[PDB]
Symmetry: C3
């Protein structure tokens, strides 16, 4: 009964987090020319996005990670002539699934930048208008820098149970 | 007629400010370990919220204040494990009314922080979709720091006719 | 056929940029007491706005410029007593058209400031709800300072094909 009630209560949050009331989160990792990882996090209800400008301090590559509640088909990205520029690309196809014990812990899109990048990304939850408007207002933004990837892995990634893929293609995350 | 027209024209803005065309405002006061008060203000139409990160410069407590146009039932707050975190609490019950001459001048929710806090709050007006979207774009954000509460009271609170509750539980504001 | 296909393919973007899928852009130029021009740009789908605070470094005047996709009637502005303040003015009437070869390249509203200004502006495109919400998340914000107007004209304005009006009332932009 300590394992029955423990596991009959563990699945009372995967069928909740995946149920609109569940948040949807995104991380944008900017990997820098000195190996330091800067990470913007945003968590929100209904939909979530990030819009930041990444410049010297020089940025080399990008990883964007969604919680498994996102509708991968809904992801869009806007990278920065105005008269002939499209407002975004639907890059969901380019996201690789991050698995732990055969469970999706997140989705990772990784790409390098040619040797200052401006970046926006948006995704919607898997699935009244005033509720969504409030959700924009309640989205919480966390922004941190880490000197080396291991430092981010050891103190940002592993303590917080966050889905990740480090530089040797090791998947971090927690199966539920 | 100088008092008739003066008071028959004074109520031609309480039945307007409370009529959607009326703004709805929020103040988040962060009270700091050296007694200084930092204040974020935001005013907007239809709905209004604040999302800021409060860190050292160390923050000790918080007061959030709504203009009387908010629907107190609509207020939500998001304070900052991701897999089991709710996106907000409905904290309207916890707001005390701020009265002046028996009139509600605002609503105040005060709480202390355990001895860096991240904070979002949202509220909706008392009571087409493109109008609300524009309203997000037109929300104006004012951010100030004050060395002591009296300095905030004397130069931020009393000059601007803003509803407030200082540390001795004195209510500031203007009846209309 | 090098001019037929060249010009039968040139109009396959003015009837696109003006078709919702087309972005809508705004620039807010803050002209400073030392003649330096600071410029905030934002581009987006469906609707676009800017909300910035302009202070010393002192700001003297403002020019706001819309791409020709905006509905000029939709423009609103919010400049910063709370109990009697309107949330915005509909300033579309005050915008002058910027023409190049008899074609509208943008709309310019210019005004001076009395001798720290807070400013928001919003406009909608000329002409499902989740698409607009994502569009807020995907709006890209560019912010630059230039030491003199000529420097902005020469390196920000002329290279990027941006509609502009400099201080001698010369219209910059590209006809399409």
């Amino acid at each position: 009964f300590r394992g029955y009630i423990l596991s009959v209560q563990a699945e009372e949050q995967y069928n909740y987090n995946n149920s609109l009331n569940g948040e949807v989160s995104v991380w944008v990792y900017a990997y820098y020319s000195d190996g330091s990882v800067l990470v913007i996090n945003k968590n929100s209800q209904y939909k979530v996005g990030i819009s930041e400008t990444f410049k010297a301090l020089k940025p080399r590559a990008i990883q964007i990670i969604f919680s498994p509640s996102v509708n991968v088909r809904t992801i869009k990205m806007a990278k920065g002539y105005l008269q002939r520029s499209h407002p975004w690309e639907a890059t969901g196809i380019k996201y690789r699934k991050i698995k732990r014990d055969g469970e999706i812990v997140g989705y990772s899109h990784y790409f390098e930048l040619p040797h200052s990048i401006s970046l926006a990304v948006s995704g919607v939850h898997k699935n009244n208008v005033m509720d969504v408007f409030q959700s924009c207002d309640l989205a919480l933004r966390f922004c941190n820098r880490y000197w080396a990837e291991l430092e981010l892995v050891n103190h940002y990634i592993s303590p917080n149970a966050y889905p990740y893929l480090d530089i040797n293609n090791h998947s971090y995350g927690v199966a539920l």
